[PDB]
Design a protein around this ligand. Structure first.
Ligand SMILES: [Ca+2]
Ligand SMILES: [Ca+2]
Ligand SMILES: [Ca+2]
Length: 241
């Protein structure tokens, strides 16, 4: 649209209340970029007084060896946040890792390759009311302090998603008596339009227009691309997981 760069956002058409969410991915990273997996209550961004409900995993480009976790509550223009950082090894853009988010009435948990890196309870959790959809996005932030100055010479960049698993919150009824039960898996052999949407919008602080042109399906993976406007393409080699 009106911006000079093109990014991408894969989002579930449906939203859910609570659950466990896993995504097998190799993230993108260069100074200035944001490569993510998030839970998001659609409409949170509307400043009409309604609450903001969001849980994040965001690889900040200048620091590929870690990701920032966050929970955003409060409301548009007055967000309450809780940014923390977690080391990832090998670096997020150097290997596939399984990223997990668990959201229940009592806590939000973040896992990497099955290991807990963060568990939050309390106020913000009590305010993650309603439903959230699962999304993945690749963009560039104008806050250099947050992600580093944007190095356009590193473009194009790609985030690869091998598969996604979504589990329903079934307290005390999952396997081994756990609290989750697998609901569905998407192996990304194709782009399933009955399950996912491709974003076509932008927001303040984002120097890219999220576009459906930058979501590709190849060799069993879903690819999100960050490119200069007018150079939207993927010709490279899809990595092996
Ligand atoms: Ca620059
Ligand atoms: Ca796959
Ligand atoms: Ca769209």
């Amino acid at each position: 649209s009106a911006k000079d760069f093109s990014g991408a956002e894969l989002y579930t058409l449906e939203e859910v209340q609570y659950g466990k969410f896993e995504a097998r991915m190799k993230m993108a990273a260069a100074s200035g970029t944001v490569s993510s997996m998030i839970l998001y209550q659609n409409g949170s961004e509307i400043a009409d007084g309604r609450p903001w409900v969001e849980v994040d995993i965001e690889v900040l480009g200048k620091n590929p060896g870690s990701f920032q976790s966050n929970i955003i509550t409060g409301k548009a223009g007055a967000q309450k946040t809780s940014e923390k950082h977690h080391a990832v090894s090998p670096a997020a853009d150097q290997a596939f890792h399984t990223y997990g988010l668990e959201w229940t009435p009592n806590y939000v948990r973040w896992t990497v390759d099955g290991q807990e890196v963060r568990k939050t309870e309390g106020g913000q959790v009590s305010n993650l009311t309603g439903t959230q959809g699962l999304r993945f996005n690749l963009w560039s932030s104008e806050s250099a302090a947050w992600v580093g100055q944007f190095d356009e010479s590193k473009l194009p960049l790609f985030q690869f998603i091998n598969w996604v698993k979504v589990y329903k919150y079934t307290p005390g009824q999952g396997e081994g008596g756990s609290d989750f039960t697998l609901d569905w898996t998407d192996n990304f052999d194709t782009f399933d339009g009955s399950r996912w949407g491709k974003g076509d919008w932008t927001f303040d602080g984002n120097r890219v227009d999220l576009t459906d042109k930058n979501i590709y399906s190849r060799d069993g993976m879903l690819i999100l691309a960050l490119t200069r406007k007018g150079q939207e393409s993927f010709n490279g080699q899809v990595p092996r997981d």
